[PDB]
Structure 1
Amino acid sequence: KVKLFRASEPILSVLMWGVNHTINELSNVPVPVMLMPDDFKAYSKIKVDNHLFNKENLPSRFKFKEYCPMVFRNLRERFGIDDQDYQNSVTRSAPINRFLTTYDRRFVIKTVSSEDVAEMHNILKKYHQFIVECHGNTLLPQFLGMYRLTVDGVETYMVVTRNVFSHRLTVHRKYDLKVAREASDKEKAKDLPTFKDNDFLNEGQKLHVGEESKKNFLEKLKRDVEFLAQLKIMDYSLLVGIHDVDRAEQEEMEVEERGPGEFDPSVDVYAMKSHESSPKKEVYFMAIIDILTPVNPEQYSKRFNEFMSNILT
């Protein structure tokens, strides 16, 4: 039962300790009837100064701050994420890759600017109830936690989201779609490049999901980017992952020498199966990302929606 918080760097140990600690405190806090305005301006702050004690993995001195814990707990709940699962995913073993995932690939942890933390506070009330009015059915990021760590007198802000991609299905190709953008010769020459818009268009890539899931994708995309427009938010992207079922079947068999294309929508919430009659059997993951940025937000809404409308069939 013993959690050592062993990690390759001390800040990950503090992250694990911090999520463990804050979730445990939260378990002794009743779940409220409703959120109250103060919950949107609240925070928890702990400062640890140990001496000759418990130094094998944690630093002796550090600080941990969690922003709006009542709100983000309610968000976890509205996204179907149990608190015990959340803490287990972060603390059973050190996150990996700044950008991290939990070891089980379920949650993504991005470090962010002080400005991003400002913008989250500014949008949080309206974001919380956009989530509530759409019952968690959205392609926007699903924010589960926001934290400030202090190790060596240095502050680091982190935002936790649900992974856009599946936690079990491999992603074989990825795009960040939003002028003109493309992938660097450096980026294009790496294990899994992030192809931008114009490499999607030069490839002639198409995603065949058939009518019903095309329609529910476009309906939630319109609702989502009208929300971000009405919040004067820009520079966001749609992140797109392609899972080639057949290639996965091969790669598994190749490690076996030394279901298939099936997934749980309650967990892989951005995932879509390819249409019955489509050249290859594929799974797609598509979500809106990078929404904490702030030329026109209405224009951004319309242009972004037209492009993403056209990547489907």
Structure 2
Amino acid sequence: VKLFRASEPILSVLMWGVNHTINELSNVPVPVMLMPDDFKAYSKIKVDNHLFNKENLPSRFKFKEYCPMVFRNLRERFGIDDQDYQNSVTRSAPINRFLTTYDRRFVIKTVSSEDVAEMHNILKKYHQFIVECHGNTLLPQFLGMYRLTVDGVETYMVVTRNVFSHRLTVHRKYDLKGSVAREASDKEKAKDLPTFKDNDFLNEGQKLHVGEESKKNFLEKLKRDVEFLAQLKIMDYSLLVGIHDVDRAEQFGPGEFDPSVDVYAMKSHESSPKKEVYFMAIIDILTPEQYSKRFNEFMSNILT
């Protein structure tokens, strides 16, 4: 029995909706190809329950899923099974707008109306790029996109594969742009999990040691990705970098992970210094050349 019990009705509706749309899709045949109309398609469901099932869910709400054939195909190309995705969302309330599913596998971001417009704008090309690069990219992996109507209010959400591991504690993070100059404010330096920027990183002189093995794949990925973004005329995106220090965590194995689940994770080299696991991906792509070459060079000068 899934109750869809959550801290807030919006979360309940999200759970119910992912459950309903995934189950509904299990009845829809996997097509031979996507069609143009699948990129303009949606499912809308409206619920009005009088005196029934009101313990966790509201009596009246709406749930809208954008382009469900497209995002279902994207899930497949990212190696994600529909039942696991459904399970991660519905087995237990997602947790702390920015949420994670209870198992930390998937991120759920509340976004604006124009974000959803922009997603419709890039979705065809993004899909075609995911096809051509065989799912091997550092771009956000867009798994689903929904609009919830609760208490008359519309809330838009986009679901991604988590950049960080769902298991390994991240010990310090960086939002890097390659840009100007930006750092962490005194108020930002106070949180246990601080978000550092380019200059903090550079001035710290901290490098990341993945060898020449991982460096190859990574840079080969990064260039194709930013070339794609530039071809779309998009900018202001970042490279999110997470660092998990193994010894500290230690103080069911240290540094042990399943690469097919922690897709962005990289082991520190042996000849390198301290022992770490790194997590690196491109975030916030929903908004030119200069930006791409610059970002690329900045991120390339971080791997030794």
> Do they superpose with TM above 0.5?
yes
Q: Separation in 2 of the partners of 1:263 and 1:276?
A: 17
2:290 corresponding residue in structure 1: 299
Aligned residues: 301
1:227-286 Cα offsets, whole Å, 9 max, x none, are 000001111000000000111111xxxxxxxx3212111111111000011111100000
Q: Separation in 2 of the partners of 1:8 and 1:200?
A: 37
1:1-50 Cα offsets, whole Å, 9 max, x none, are x0000000010000000000000100000011111111111000001111
* Pairwise CA distance, 1:309: 0.5
* Pairwise CA distance, 1:191: 1.3
Taking only the aligned residue pairs, the percentage that are identical comes to 100
Three-state SS of the structure 2 residue aligned to 1:264 is coil
Q: Separation in 2 of the partners of 1:305 and 1:140?
A: 14
Q: Separation in 2 of the partners of 1:38 and 1:169?
A: 41
Three-state SS of the structure 1 residue aligned to 2:158 is strand
* Pairwise CA distance, 1:129: 1.1
Q: Separation in 2 of the partners of 1:305 and 1:262?
A: 29
* Pairwise CA distance, 1:203: 1.3
1:239 corresponding residue in structure 2: 240
* Pairwise CA distance, 1:52: 0.8
Where structure 2 has 5 or more consecutive residues not aligned to the other structure, the ranges are none
1:71-121 Cα offsets, whole Å, 9 max, x none, are 000000000100000000000000001000000000000000101101110
Q: Separation in 2 of the partners of 1:37 and 1:113?
A: 24
Q: Separation in 2 of the partners of 1:298 and 1:184?
A: 29
- After TM superposition, the runs of 4+ consecutive aligned structure 1 residues lying more than 3 A away are none
Three-state SS of the structure 2 residue aligned to 1:25 is helix
1:140-180 Cα offsets, whole Å, 9 max, x none, are 00000000001010000000000000011110000000111
Three-state SS of the structure 2 residue aligned to 1:210 is coil
* Pairwise CA distance, 1:54: 0.6
Where structure 1 has 5 or more consecutive residues not aligned to the other structure, the ranges are 251-258
Q: Separation in 2 of the partners of 1:240 and 1:227?
A: 20
* Pairwise CA distance, 1:184: 1.2
Q: TM-score, normalised by structure 2?
A: 0.98
1:64 corresponding residue in structure 2: 63
Three-state SS of the structure 2 residue aligned to 1:272 is strand
Q: Separation in 2 of the partners of 1:284 and 1:267?
A: 14
Q: Separation in 2 of the partners of 1:290 and 1:275?
A: 29
* Pairwise CA distance, 1:193: 0.7
Q: Separation in 1 of the partners of 2:235 and 2:85?
A: 29
* Pairwise CA distance, 1:139: 0.3
Three-state SS of the structure 2 residue aligned to 1:131 is helix
More divergent stretch after superposition (260-269 vs 278-287): 260-269
* Pairwise CA distance, 1:312: 1.0
Three-state SS of the structure 2 residue aligned to 1:169 is coil
1:34 corresponding residue in structure 2: 33
Q: TM-score, normalised by structure 1?
A: 0.95
* Pairwise CA distance, 1:188: 0.8
Q: Separation in 2 of the partners of 1:74 and 1:144?
A: 9
Q: Separation in 2 of the partners of 1:191 and 1:13?
A: 29
Q: Separation in 2 of the partners of 1:134 and 1:302?
A: 20
Q: Separation in 1 of the partners of 2:68 and 2:138?
A: 23
Q: Separation in 2 of the partners of 1:5 and 1:282?
A: 37
1:169 corresponding residue in structure 2: 168
Q: Separation in 2 of the partners of 1:229 and 1:261?
A: 35
